[PDB]
Amino acid sequence: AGITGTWYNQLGSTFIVTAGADGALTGTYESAVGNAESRYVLTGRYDSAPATDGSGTALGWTVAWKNNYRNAHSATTWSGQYVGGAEARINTQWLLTSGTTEANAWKSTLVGHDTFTKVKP
Amino acid sequence: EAGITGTWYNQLGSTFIVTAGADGALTGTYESAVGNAESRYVLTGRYDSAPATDGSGTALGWTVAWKNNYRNAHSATTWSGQYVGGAEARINTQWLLTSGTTEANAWKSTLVGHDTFTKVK
Amino acid sequence: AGITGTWYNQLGSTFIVTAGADGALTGTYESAVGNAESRYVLTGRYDSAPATDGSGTALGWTVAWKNNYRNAHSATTWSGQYVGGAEARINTQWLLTSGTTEANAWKSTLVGHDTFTKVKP
Amino acid sequence: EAGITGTWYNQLGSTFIVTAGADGALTGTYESAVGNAESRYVLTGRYDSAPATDGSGTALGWTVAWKNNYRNAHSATTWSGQYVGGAEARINTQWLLTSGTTEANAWKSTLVGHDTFTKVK
Ligand SMILES: NC(=O)c1coc(CN(Cc2ccc3c(c2)OCO3)C(=O)c2coc(CN(Cc3ccc4c(c3)OCO4)C(=O)c3coc(CCl)n3)n2)n1
Ligand SMILES: NC(=O)c1coc(CN(Cc2ccc3c(c2)OCO3)C(=O)c2coc(CN(Cc3ccc4c(c3)OCO4)C(=O)c3coc(CCl)n3)n2)n1
Ligand SMILES: CCCCCCCCC(=O)CCCO
Ligand SMILES: CCCCCCCCC(=O)CCCO
């Protein structure tokens, strides 16, 4: 199959992505219900010629949490790897930075991890 | 927009050339002074195109997959941070560098760090 | 039950910890086989009076990877929360810093996540 | 040993008083200039007691659970980093601040950042 497709986490997120031949990732990141107000633009990059030794495919993407409905003044980046096969998976670590004053900059960034599969919950 | 658009350097001597689009897109090229990297790489990301007008920074993020026509490190870095405008413009970030690995080495796939970018002119 | 006990991850780690009444965490971190050469001292802290609203118990600990047999010139810290109940769990994020030269300091720190339970694999 | 032992301050004005034991223990107190914190808190950690003698830093880590006799923030911070000796002694760290949360808010339990500690005298 491949990176292109509809992916889901176990917490209520869905993202739809196209992986371009030369490394582009473009798509939408949304809630499980998928209403317009919860949909945000996603853009990133992936290694379009991964190693031929069984290693995963490195990738990353960003979502700024602003759309035509809402603005959280924040952005998340996910850095991870795609692993193909019967149950394709994208394993990531992420950073969510909020726009803050200088006084609050020390606590501007959340960190976490998330795994996505193409299985709809 | 104009605030983010331009040439930036980090504390290691890396170069980031970016254009901030009216729709929240970040596009440009990145040249790393460190790691398994040579020449320029494509970058893509997102920023908050309508930040708060309260002295808060502008949230943003971008990705570089470390493949270009000259080298392939089978890895990708995401930078998550905020742009702080004014006379002394800076982009303060935290980053995640993920390498494609086998499943047994996935626990040690990701490096974390922090870069401060200073705007040229 | 509680934090005190023998915990395991899904990758071949085991740790034995005592949680003191006033917040101390003290124990041993080792491989699944548990031979002397893979055993390292663990020390940390936990919140000894967690919130009474269903929230997890915050904690953290460190292992420096030096014992009487080996020295990797590195140290890992785990930051997370303990969640009690029938299948007690400790959910963590971790940072593994290696001692490096100044030239390699940018790539000194790995990041990851791990979950532990009291179930022996 | 003597290199690490002493009083340190970070870029935010926080105070770290530590004793490095011959067995690799770090013990002391921490006073934070930021966050839900007041007065001194116990800290415990570990360091590499036999670092490489090649100009590399000394790996270390420590934890503070944000409970003392005056306040309880139901959170814990771990710092992972390296001590760089000489006339200009520094401890360069990355940290993870985890708060106890309900399961629904666990995704946003952990903040990440970086602190530089400078040794007094
Ligand atoms: N609803 C908006 O309009 C909007 C505007 O801004 C944001 C930012 N967010 C989404 C978000 C997803 C993923 C991330 C992130 C942030 O940062 C880190 O990764 C949240 O405030 C949020 C609140 O509750 C959760 C939890 N959840 C379910 C969910 C609810 C609403 C969503 C949504 C997902 O997608 C858009 O809408 C996750 O799936 C979850 C959170 O984090 C992880 C990985 Cl561990 N999974 N998220 N939402
Ligand atoms: N063997 C030593 O004598 C010695 C000296 O120094 C170290 C450092 N290590 C252990 C380690 C555990 C846990 C961590 C860590 C590092 O940093 C982050 O968390 C590794 O080099 C390592 C190599 O392979 C793995 C994977 N694995 C199995 C394992 C093998 C040997 C062990 C061991 C565990 O325990 C001691 O011995 C994990 O369980 C694993 C790694 O990471 C995660 C969380 Cl995702 N799980 N680890 N080993
Ligand atoms: C170990 C070699 C792989 C690295 C390829 C280039 C990555 C550069 C990077 O992420 C820099 C982060 C600090 O600015
Ligand atoms: C939001 C309030 C909770 C914080 C309690 C104190 C934490 C201090 C901390 O980790 C500082 C990290 C930067 O030096």
Is there a contact between D64 and D44 (Cβ–Cβ < 8 Å)? no
Find, among C102, B112, C104, C75, the residue nearest to D84 by Cα: C102
Count up the domains in chain B and report the number: 1
CA distance D58 to D80: 11
Place of tokens 């971190």: C29
CA distance C108 to C110: 7
Asked whether B109 lines ligand 3 (CB < 6 A), one says no
* Residue C2, C-beta contacts closer than 8 angstroms, at least 6 positions apart: C19, C84, C88
Tell me: is residue D47 an annotated ligand-binding position.
Answer: no
The 8 Å CB, 24+ separation contacts for B14-22 are: B14/B115, B16/B43, B16/B91, B16/B117, B18/B43, B18/B62, B20/B47, B20/B49, B22/B49
A10 interfaces chain C, CB cutoff of 8 Å: no
Is there a contact between C111 and A95 (Cβ–Cβ < 8 Å)? no
Is there a contact between A79 and A54 (Cβ–Cβ < 8 Å)? no
Closest-lying ligand 2 atom to the alpha carbon of residue C14: 35
The 8 Å CB, 24+ separation contacts for A86-91 are: A87/A117, A87/A119, A88/A1, A88/A2, A88/A5, A88/A117, A88/A118, A89/A115, A89/A116, A89/A117, A90/A3, A90/A7, A90/A59, A90/A115, A90/A116, A90/A117, A91/A56, A91/A115, A91/B106
HSE, side-chain direction, 13 A CA sphere, residue A45 = 30
Question: What's at B88, amino acid-wise?
Answer: E
Closest-lying ligand 3 atom to the alpha carbon of residue C107: 1
Is there a contact between D76 and D107 (Cβ–Cβ < 8 Å)? no
* Structural tokens at position B19: 């254009």
Is there a contact between A1 and A90 (Cβ–Cβ < 8 Å)? no
* Structural tokens at position C3: 């934090």
CA distance D40 to D30: 5
CA distance C51 to A115: 29
Asked whether B63 lines ligand 3 (CB < 6 A), one says no
Find, among D67, B36, D33, the residue nearest to C20 by Cα: D67
HSE, side-chain direction, 13 A CA sphere, residue D105 = 11
Quote the Cα angle for D93-D97-D103, to 5°.
150
Q: Is the dihedral of CA D16, D20, D23, D28 positive or negative?
A: negative
CA distance C118 to B23: 49
Determine the residue of B67, B97, B99, B117 to mutate for testing ligand 3's pocket, defined as the one with the most ligand atoms within 8 A of the Cβ atom.
B97
Judged by its nearest atom, the ligand closest to the C-alpha of residue C30 is: 2
CA dihedral C58, A91, C5, D79 (to 10 degrees): -40
Task: Note down the domain range covering C104.
Answer: 1-121
Question: What's at B116, amino acid-wise?
Answer: T
Resolution (A): 1.4
CB atoms within 10 A of CB B106: 20
CATH number at residue C119: 2.40.128.30
CA distance B109 to C96: 12
Is there a contact between C120 and D107 (Cβ–Cβ < 8 Å)? no
CA dihedral C74, C76, C77, C78 (to 10 degrees): 180
Is there a contact between B94 and B116 (Cβ–Cβ < 8 Å)? no
DSSP assignment, residue A89? E
| Residue to test with chain A: of C111, C114, C115, most A Cβ within 10 A | C111
CA distance B31 to B41: 6
* Residue A50, C-beta contacts closer than 8 angstroms, at least 6 positions apart: A56, A57, A58, B74, B100
Task: Please name the helix (run of DSSP H) or strand (run of DSSP E) that holds residue D82, with its range, or none.
Answer: strand D72-84
